[PDB]
């Protein structure tokens, strides 16, 4: 070494030419992912591909104040919303068996979120004009007129955010 430089630190003492890779396809992969999710939302046709996630507090004192999307609502949250995990998982509601509600604030906030989603749901009949009233907390099936008049309305994706 010479002059007043930082002491060198480069970790290139192995065969690195074999491990270097360049992402020429970053935006091409962007387009491919966009197309895939477009096609899988056209395939299910009206029902969003997004699934509802709970609001949880980030751990540690660094991110204490911030909230984010967790994975799965708790059993208590689902029961407060009035539906079983097995039923909830069929209407786009994530469930996780690990999380527990350590505070009433989180419990009630996620219950209110679940209730808002349930009240926003309109259910398509399983048997094409044989509407029933559901089970496991699933809301009753909407009928032909309301389904037809709601199928042309913009679905609110803000609920999933």
């Amino acid at each position: 070494v010479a002059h007043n430089n930082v002491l060198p630190n480069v970790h290139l003492h192995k065969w690195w030419q074999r491990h270097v890779r360049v992402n020429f396809s970053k935006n091409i992969k962007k387009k491919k992912r966009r197309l895939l999710r477009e096609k899988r939302r056209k395939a299910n046709g009206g029902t969003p591909i997004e699934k509802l996630h709970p609001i949880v507090h980030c751990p540690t004192q660094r991110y204490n104040f911030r909230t984010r999307l967790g994975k799965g609502f708790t059993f208590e949250e689902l029961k407060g919303a009035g539906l079983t995990p097995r039923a909830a998982q069929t209407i786009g509601i994530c469930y996780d068996k690990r999380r527990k509600n350590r505070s009433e604030e989180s419990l009630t906030k996620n219950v209110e979120r679940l209730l808002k989603y349930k009240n926003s749901l309109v259910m398509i009949p399983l048997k094409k004009n044989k509407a029933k009233k559901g089970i496991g907390g699933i809301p009753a099936d909407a009928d032909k007129n309301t389904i037809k008049e709601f199928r042309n309305k913009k679905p609110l994706l803000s609920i999933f955010k």
Binding site: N44, G45, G46, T47, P48, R86, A87, Q89, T90, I91, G92, Y117, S120, L121, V122, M123, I124, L126, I135, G136, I138, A142, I147, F150, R151, K153, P155, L156, L157, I159
Partner: peptide, 14 residues
Amino acid sequence: KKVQNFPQRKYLVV
């Protein structure tokens, strides 16, 4: 008998 009784189903979000 699980999948028949609780199938994935179509719905709309308003």
